[PDB]
Design a protein around this ligand. Sequence first.
Ligand SMILES: [Mg+2]
Ligand SMILES: [Mg+2]
Ligand SMILES: [Mg+2]
Ligand SMILES: [Mg+2]
Ligand SMILES: [Mg+2]
Ligand SMILES: [Mg+2]
Ligand SMILES: [Mg+2]
Ligand SMILES: [Mg+2]
Ligand SMILES: [Mg+2]
Ligand SMILES: [Mg+2]
Ligand SMILES: [Mg+2]
Ligand SMILES: [Mg+2]
Ligand SMILES: [Mg+2]
Ligand SMILES: [Mg+2]
Ligand SMILES: [Mg+2]
Ligand SMILES: [Mg+2]
Ligand SMILES: [Mg+2]
Ligand SMILES: [Mg+2]
Ligand SMILES: [Mg+2]
Ligand SMILES: [Mg+2]
Ligand SMILES: [Mg+2]
Ligand SMILES: [Mg+2]
Ligand SMILES: [Mg+2]
Lengths: 124, 205, 95, 204, 147, 211
Amino acid sequence: LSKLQYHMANHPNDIAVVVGSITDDKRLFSLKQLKVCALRFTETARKRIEDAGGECLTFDQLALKYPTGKKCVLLRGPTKARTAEKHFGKAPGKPKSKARPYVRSKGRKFEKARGRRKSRAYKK
Amino acid sequence: AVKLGAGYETSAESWGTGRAVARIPRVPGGGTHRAGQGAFGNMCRGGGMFNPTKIWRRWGRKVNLKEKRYAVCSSIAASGVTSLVLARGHRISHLKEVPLVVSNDIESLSKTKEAVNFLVSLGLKDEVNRLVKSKKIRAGKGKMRNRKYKIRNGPLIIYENDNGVKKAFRNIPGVDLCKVTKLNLLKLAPGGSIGRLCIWSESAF
Amino acid sequence: GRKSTIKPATGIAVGFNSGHVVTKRNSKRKELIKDVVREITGFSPYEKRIIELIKIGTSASTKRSLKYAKKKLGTHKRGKAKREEIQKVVILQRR
Amino acid sequence: GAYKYIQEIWKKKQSDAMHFLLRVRTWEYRQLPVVHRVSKPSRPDKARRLGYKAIQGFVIYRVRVRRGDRKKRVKKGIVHGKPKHQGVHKQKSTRNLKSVAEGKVGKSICGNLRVLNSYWVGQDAVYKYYEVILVDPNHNAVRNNPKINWICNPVHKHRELRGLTSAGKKYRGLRVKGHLSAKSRPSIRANWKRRQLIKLRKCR
Amino acid sequence: ATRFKKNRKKRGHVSAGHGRVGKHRKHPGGRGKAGGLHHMRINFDKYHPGYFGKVGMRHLNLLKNRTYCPTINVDKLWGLLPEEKKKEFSENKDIAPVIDVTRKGYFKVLGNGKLKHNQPIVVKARYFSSVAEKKIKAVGGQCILVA
Amino acid sequence: VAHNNVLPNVHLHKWWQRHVRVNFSKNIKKKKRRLLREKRRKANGGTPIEKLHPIVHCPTQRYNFRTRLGKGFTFEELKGAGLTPRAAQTIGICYDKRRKNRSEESLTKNVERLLKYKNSLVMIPLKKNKAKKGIGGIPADADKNTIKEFRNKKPLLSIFKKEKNTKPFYETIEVSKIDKEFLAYKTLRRAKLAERRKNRRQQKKDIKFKS
RNA sequence: GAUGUUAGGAGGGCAAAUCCGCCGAAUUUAAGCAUAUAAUUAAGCGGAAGAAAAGAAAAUAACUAUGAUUCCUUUAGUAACGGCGAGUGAACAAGGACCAGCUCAAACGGUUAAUCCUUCGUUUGGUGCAAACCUUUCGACGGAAUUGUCGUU
RNA sequence: UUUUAAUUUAUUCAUUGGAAUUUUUCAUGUCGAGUCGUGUUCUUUGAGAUUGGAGCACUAAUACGUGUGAUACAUUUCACA
RNA sequence: ACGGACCAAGGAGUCUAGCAAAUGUGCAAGUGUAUAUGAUUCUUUAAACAUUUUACGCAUAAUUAAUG
RNA sequence: UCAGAACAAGUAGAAAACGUGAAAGCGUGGCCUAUCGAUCCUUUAUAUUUGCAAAAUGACGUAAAUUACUUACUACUGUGC
Ligand SMILES: [Mg+2]
Ligand SMILES: [Mg+2]
Ligand SMILES: [Mg+2]
Ligand SMILES: [Mg+2]
Ligand SMILES: [Mg+2]
Ligand SMILES: [Mg+2]
Ligand SMILES: [Mg+2]
Ligand SMILES: [Mg+2]
Ligand SMILES: [Mg+2]
Ligand SMILES: [Mg+2]
Ligand SMILES: [Mg+2]
Ligand SMILES: [Mg+2]
Ligand SMILES: [Mg+2]
Ligand SMILES: [Mg+2]
Ligand SMILES: [Mg+2]
Ligand SMILES: [Mg+2]
Ligand SMILES: [Mg+2]
Ligand SMILES: [Mg+2]
Ligand SMILES: [Mg+2]
Ligand SMILES: [Mg+2]
Ligand SMILES: [Mg+2]
Ligand SMILES: [Mg+2]
Ligand SMILES: [Mg+2]
């Protein structure tokens, strides 16, 4: 919701459309009068929107209203913010890679010695 | 599950190479036909089956409570919708309203005959007839395992309290009974097919 | 880690008497027997040796005695205790 | 008071008087047969402190056990496996000599009786001598008396052979409660089994 | 289910998908973690950098309880109140909420994010981070150590 | 091992197949248990299977705040209630020889609970009719009609379950009542710093006391 | 102390899935192997019961503290161990099932062992068609026991 | 048929004996030794200057004691047993 | 080069554990009702239903050998 | 070299502090291309960094205070590991 709000900030009244789910944000305090199309609203988010005196539109409704998407704004949520994606890219082992190793757990006992500190052979 | 050491109860060992016989483990000794025979191993008569079935196969599946609830709701909705019900196979062409609701007098019915009569009056005569017809002896080996008859699935009577419905509709072929509180998706959507014909008491509704 | 029984606990998670608010709520025969035993049995050889060492009188001697006790009994506490007992006995004898 | 006094006397053990007694007694025992009945406890107080009572069915048996380790049983000294397991000669048994003592009396010699307990009595370098307190569970004097009666039950056949006597409890490590003994409690083997156990869940 | 397993798709293909020359043998590379540090060193290096060797102090009896401290960021603190109550608080600058953060199952208050300006908030918790405390104060609130 | 996967950690190098228990018995076992408990209840005509337990605070810094049923009531609490241990045992209440009271408040709470329980409970006579007063703790035996009435009413099992949380967590405070000068982090860190030395002094104090 | 075909009794063998003691490998894994691993497993020997074992704190905590054992969910593949390699790996707390506590020894009672048992009996009952059982308290004649039975806690 | 709940009827008279709390005096008792423990060996453990066990040697203290508080030690608190 | 005299039937990537990726599905700063309880649940029912008139997991914060 | 991992050997710098030169500069060894070594363990250096798991050990240090389980405040706090 916060992200949605941020995106709507400059152009008001026009209708944010989001092809996925919109989740609510406890970290928001105030909610503006938002008009949002989405595939799914988590219930609390929906409630919040309602309270704001906003509108939750489904895709069919949007189509009915704005079939050429006039005064719409496509938005995406954070795609590569997924935890799976943090294991991708250059493998941890290759230098300057910020890829999480697949490890049982965290703590000194797990993947924090040889090849992770200059003191034990090398680093990264 | 197959019993643990099935096919492996023998002492068999392979004779090895220089006898002009494949090197499958052989039963030792003499006198019997069994002597010298291929012993354990999936290929052999009297062998163990390949990956013998074990009790620790995953039998059940956890399904998310929420998902289950959703499924139940959807089945209820389906039962609502006439077309869906029709598709599901019921002879419902002579029933007016398909969220089919009936007075609480039904919950007190004492006699299967009476229930049958009521059903007929409703319009489900045809359905009843179909149900009667469609008790047939299964194809295959089900026959040997207490699955002798195969019966088509009739209406589902949903009731708030049993003052007789349980017992009266018990014994009409294919007719099932469920308390509104404890709705079973297995009954609402047999074979995972949406839109069973549900007959509700008004209290239940 | 440590606390005090007097005073309530400072309403803090960590540090000295840290914790919650809550108001706190809180022979002769033997001797005779021992004497009898002594009369009967006397001492055991190690004990005797220790006594002798003690009698010798000096700090070095005492140290030696202590060491001996440690060797025999095992553990410094027990040995110390034994030494103390022997000293007491010696004192008694002297009276 | 008397028993207190004798307790105190026996605590001394290396003191002259006690020492002499021990010397005599162990010498005497060296001569008698390995397991043999005695009429009265040699350490009445100690017997009392265990389970002993002067009821008809209670008997004391003096038993002698060889001291020391038991050579690993193998035809000739040689063991055929990996070096870790190769040694004989410094192989110390899981059971106590006391346990062994009680075992030998309890098992074939007094199969009729039930071993209650056992106490130390004496030792030489060759042998340790224990007196083991046993009870006849069929003697009515024992059957009737509600305290003690318990031993008449069939669950207590050959307590000594299952490590259920005090000595048994010791070497099973049930004497030590706590974090020191977490791994052995319902029984070591049982505990192990439990820890191994894979619980699946039909639903899963 | 078996019917949509790949092996069923390879049914009549001779090698069952495991290749004709390089066969399918049982445990060709060694068993389990096996030659990590010898013939499987490279894999370990490239996917499991810090795997070999030990580091740091032993901690012979841990007791994860002693050291348990679920955290929350100040940003999330106002979220811990219901919508209507929050609105009420916003309306009345004259009165502030105390928040027993322990009652909601968090011990430490950390300081990630903004707090609504001027809206003063009283925070009860066991631990505060300097920054979180500063944030709270700047907003005219108090941090009250609880236990 | 191959590719980028977790390093495998599967403890199955022993003869694991020997001890796999699959719980086909779960629901049926539960049902059986239920049946057994019902039977027990029936046997104890009217009286409750369940025994009174004191609420207690869980140990360790992390469960500190939570409260749950302990075993057994502590001699002191019994005394407060006006009750003998044996007597308590005989009724529906658990006794715990080894539990001790540090907190007055806690003790008070449990004696309150005990009192409540006492108030609730009505005692069937031992030999019929003959109504006599109890021993040490136990209340009096009621007459027949009263007993009948009680039976006719529902047997309450609210006391045997723990009292749920009081709640708060949101409480209004007046802005003028806030103390804007109280460095909480500073207090913490300072406290941490000063711990050892306070420890040094406490020990000294203790030593002094010991003479 | 021996001795008895003395009077009365007991043990022995079978069976084992779970169970309790010992005793005790190696294949195997480590791409070799020697410590490790397999495994406190298999085999061996002994011993019980409808369950066994455990069990009423020389316990855990460091809290606002809990409170016998067992078992389940978890803690946790964690602390830790380990040619720190392969691999092994608990405990407390938390949530439940179930919940039960106790008696010897020691202290005390000598204006008296009050205890206990064997044999022989005696005479009210209860169910049974009988067979048997069930209990009822009363003595004797024996012994046992002051190197300690019983009561009191 | 099995038992085990509820319900129904107990009322008179005898006295030996015991129990709980409650006052008030006086008693500060007793609390398991070749055992614990240490050393050393071997085993077992996740237990790490040794987790349990065992063999051997040495061998204690009395409740103000001794035993736990997962790093060997000393000096000493404290908590728990 | 090897295997195949012929024919019939049997005859070989499976099942569990835990991890990952992919994709579907639910809900989403949460999620999973775990054991267990409860029900007017009892051929099917060993499922289904329910969750007491701040359990735990994984995630929501990282980092340090560590006090932190 | 190459997986564009490591080690090793270099190239280019930066922050210190110096050397040399009058200076500009040059110097992070040998005019350049070889002369060499992971984990674990050991070892000795370094440090206003920590720990040994209920606590303490510099130190009742410095102030107060009264005899006591007093109140503040201190970067420097045992051996061993
Ligand atoms: Mg077969
Ligand atoms: Mg067919
Ligand atoms: Mg051995
Ligand atoms: Mg192909
Ligand atoms: Mg091939
Ligand atoms: Mg090839
Ligand atoms: Mg036998
Ligand atoms: Mg190998
Ligand atoms: Mg190999
Ligand atoms: Mg080999
Ligand atoms: Mg076996
Ligand atoms: Mg038992
Ligand atoms: Mg467990
Ligand atoms: Mg985990
Ligand atoms: Mg192991
Ligand atoms: Mg004691
Ligand atoms: Mg081992
Ligand atoms: Mg601890
Ligand atoms: Mg050829
Ligand atoms: Mg060939
Ligand atoms: Mg051929
Ligand atoms: Mg052929
Ligand atoms: Mg997925």
